Design a protein around this ligand. Structure first.
Ligand SMILES: Nc1nc2c(ncn2[C@@H]2O[C@H](COP(=O)(O)OP(=O)(O)OP(=O)(O)O)[C@@H](O)[C@H]2O)c(=O)[nH]1
Ligand SMILES: Nc1nc2c(ncn2[C@@H]2O[C@H](COP(=O)(O)OP(=O)(O)OP(=O)(O)O)[C@@H](O)[C@H]2O)c(=O)[nH]1
Ligand SMILES: Nc1nc2c(ncn2[C@@H]2O[C@H](COP(=O)(O)OP(=O)(O)OP(=O)(O)O)[C@@H](O)[C@H]2O)c(=O)[nH]1
Ligand SMILES: Nc1nc2c(ncn2[C@@H]2O[C@H](COP(=O)(O)OP(=O)(O)OP(=O)(O)O)[C@@H](O)[C@H]2O)c(=O)[nH]1
Ligand SMILES: Nc1nc2c(ncn2[C@@H]2O[C@H](COP(=O)(O)OP(=O)(O)OP(=O)(O)O)[C@@H](O)[C@H]2O)c(=O)[nH]1
Lengths: 221, 221, 221, 220, 221
């Protein structure tokens, strides 16, 4: 069993741009179940170096959990077998204005500290010959979010991907997020948020389409 | 009795653009009640295939209710007999400025999943010779909304129809909505909302008027 | 005694532009007492026609009240004897910028149904040689609001009237309202509202002045 | 001319533009206290003319209070002797951008009725050679605010005054107030609000500048 | 160990433009522990001049506290030894859009009164060749914040600092702050708040970019 068509096209598009999250050739396909078990073991070791009575009934299953989380959960975006099934319909309606999906739930991790990134994404595109099923947008945002990320790069990966799938450069992405690596640690700023945006096609070149999008960005409820 | 003048003008205009909901020739006028029974029955089979005790006094009816729902309420926009009675008045006031009606209660269904689309439409037009009855706008929005829809298309319909009835291309239609095929299902995003817009004449050609509309779009209470 | 210089020019200027309220020739001065009793006679008839019990000590005075409301209150704008005494001062301050009165309380009645129109109005003007008393801007708005109305014509009247008294076509009026003929019955839309605007002088010609005004709006219930 | 270099420069600058509150030459300097006793006396007459029991313990000291309020309080801005002390600091950091001060408490009185005008001001300027202390703006507003007023003029006085003190035209004033002569009286509009503004220099000419201020005006 | 490379460039950069906080070249040069004790000496004296009972088991440790606060806390920005360890990753993602960090906690003190300055800061920049770590921006802001400040000057320092550190003139800084030397005393304005902005590169020359920034400024939660 091997990958999908849309998946391939995207992946290549990001590679051709140096936007792919830093990875090393898989070499051999290590039995996934065996991958966790090894990691879980490593976690055990760290927790011990922290003097954590594993004999207890609560922390006992954590080493396992953390492994299952990294392997089959918050980093799934790393594997393209998880790329969402994409579907498009003929732009019969001749939609020549932008379609915007705002306040998309975006959950991620800052690759620097492996800590929570809680945010919101706002995506918009102007249909060329295809209108994409709304959910696919969300699904595409959450795919790239589930990986060790750098907001700036995440935003970018979302753009090129939508552009590749929709068949248009007229796509704009915008992520607004709270970094817990900045919040629950270090400088510990509890109020600040980070906003990153990637503007394609007209959203970049057209001064009209640009400010139409940015103006409708950053909403609450 | 056949139909209505406006209804026909509109149906035609939409067909001449390919904006009519993908319909098949009704062929023979099957008795309306005959359909609800058939559908009601089909629903019975469905529920039974879901192993549900139709014997129970509650589920017992449902097939009929779901039947009556499809045919008579949420899809009544499919039959132009339910087209709203259109009424105009000479623009003796010589209103050359735009008239806007916001936060219009739009209830709809996604043709992809036959699920609730909960939205709010904003409509604007610049009076040429006539001024439409305000509630009529609300009523047209709801007409096309009451069909298995696609927001991108729904917006287009509300524009064309309104342009036709008013006699001006200067009509703008914006729709903020929550999709439950995105929220209460699949990806299960609880916070996102889709926004589509369709601009006519000036609302498109004149950068001035265009934004005067877009700046006034999206409001709460 | 007859009327007032201002109420004259205003009414005159309104008929000239064909914006005045659709009134019939004068017929003959009917004693104000007479008209009220007369309307009550009809209200009594209408109530009996509804099967109410005017005997009831409560309803018993409604015919009399409704009459008083129509002639002495909610429609008193049809009578220019009610036109507010406009007072001004020389513009020795050389105020070449726009003055703005936002959120003016506007209570009106829709003529199509003789039902409550509840709104907020924003008025702005660039003082030429005279600076009008603030509350006057309020009264003038409420004068024309106490008439069976059409939001579109109402806005236009306010504009024309202020231009006449202020001596500048540089006035702007905007009205955001909820129509209970839309909300309380018929389509029964409980979330929508209508916004109408009339831009005069620079507020229309000067692209820059227009947005300064239009931008400063949206507040109410 | 009155009693201060800054105060004098301003008062002269406003008189030179017909913006000074309509005042009649003082002539002789009757004792301040002497006026309160006279005012109080007149009010006493009014309260009597209004069939009010001054004999009662409360309304008894009200004439004096009202008299006091007029002379030493709500109309304090009339006497430039009360002008705030202005202090600026050399613009060594060269701030070629606008500095904005918003939601500046403003309490005045309509000269039409002598009733509460409750507002909020927003001032912005572009430092030329000097930068002013922040509280000074707040103070300059409230100075011209403590006079029987007309919002449209109040805004004009604020603007000029500042321009002078800062030695620049690039100043901007925007007042957003509620007039109780319109709320607890007359048409009695409990919701309305008046927003006057006075743009100068670049806030008047330069389209870009002009709107940078207006977009950031009106804030809760 | 002298300072830090970036700490030095920045310092030098700030002295070149006369944006350094007015400081002297020590004359008598002494120990840090000695400095706190002398200040605490004076605080004790002031507190006695205020007839405060230093005997009270409470007020006793106050001079010593105020001493440690001025030397190791609220003014720690005066010593470049405290500068934040900056780190940048090569902008391989080629991010050519403005990354924005909003509502950054800013705790400062007014040099005119030694009273608290409570505000929020918004920083944005266009990544040229390198992408800085987010928290760092927060840090750079707070570094210049802990000094007897002038909001105007503080804004400029964050700007230059960031420009020099990121090696780009495309940086915009805006600070919204409440000065208790305005609020808690003197004129006592309980509602006012000063806003300052500093625009570099495209944020100044490019009107297009200049408004993208100024629009996404001043946010709540
Ligand atoms: N463009 C558009 N797409 C819509 C609309 N309503 C539902 N959709 C999308 O149509 C798609 C259903 O496509 P399928 O190929 O059957 O996939 P699916 O498993 O049903 O989709 P999800 O589970 O929702 O991702 C989804 O992407 C829905 O979100 C609508 O108004 N406009
Ligand atoms: N541009 C960017 N920076 C990020 C992102 N996630 C974390 N960072 C920054 O990367 C930096 C971590 O750099 P290091 O050199 O390891 O220093 P550190 O001790 O972690 O620094 P602090 O977090 O400030 O305590 C910090 O400045 C984080 O705020 C991200 O998505 N984008
Ligand atoms: N332009 C302006 N008008 C003001 C200002 N303050 C009070 N006014 C107006 O002065 C008028 C009072 O005029 P009068 O002739 O005494 O009549 P009135 O009985 O007070 O009328 P109403 O105020 O409408 O009740 C009103 O229109 C007030 O709103 C102000 O600062 N500017
Ligand atoms: N343009 C405008 N229309 C108004 C205004 N007030 C009421 N109307 C509209 O005038 C119409 C009354 O027209 P009719 O042909 O009698 O229809 P109706 O059955 O009474 O109205 P609905 O039940 O709402 O469809 C409605 O569409 C009202 O909403 C108003 O100020 N401006
Ligand atoms: N421009 C600026 N002024 C500031 C800042 N912080 C405090 N100030 C002002 O500096 C001034 C102190 O000037 P002084 O001449 O000593 O007056 P003062 O009696 O101490 O101050 P007030 O009692 O408030 O009038 C005040 O206007 C403060 O509000 C700041 O960051 N920028």
């Amino acid at each position: 069993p091997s990958l999908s068509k849309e998946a391939a096209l995207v992946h290549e598009a990001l590679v051709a741009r140096g936007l792919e999250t830093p990875l090393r050739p898989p070499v051999h396909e290590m039995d996934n179940e065996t991958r966790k078990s090894l990691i879980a073991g490593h976690m055990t070791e760290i927790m011990q170096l922290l003097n954590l009575d594993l004999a207890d009934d609560s922390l006992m299953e954590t080493p396992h959990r953390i492994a299952k989380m990294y392997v089959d959960e918050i980093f799934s975006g790393l594997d393209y077998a998880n790329f969402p099934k994409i579907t498009l319909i003929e732009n019969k309606m001749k939609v020549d204005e932008m379609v915007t999906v705002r306040d998309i739930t975006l959950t991620s991790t800052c690759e620097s500290h492996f800590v929570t990134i809680d945010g919101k994404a706002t995506v918009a595109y102007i249909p060329k010959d295809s209108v994409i099923g709304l959910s696919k947008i969300n699904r595409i945002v959450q795919f790239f979010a589930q990986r060790p990320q750098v907001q700036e790069r995440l935003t970018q990966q979302i753009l090129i991907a939508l552009q590749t799938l929709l068949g248009t450069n007229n796509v704009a992405v915008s992520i607004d997020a709270v970094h817990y690596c900045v919040k629950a640690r270090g400088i510990r700023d509890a109020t600040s948020a980070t906003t990153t945006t990637s503007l394609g096609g007209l959203f970049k070149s057209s001064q009209n389409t640009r400010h139409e999008f940015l103006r409708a960005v950053r909403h609450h409820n």
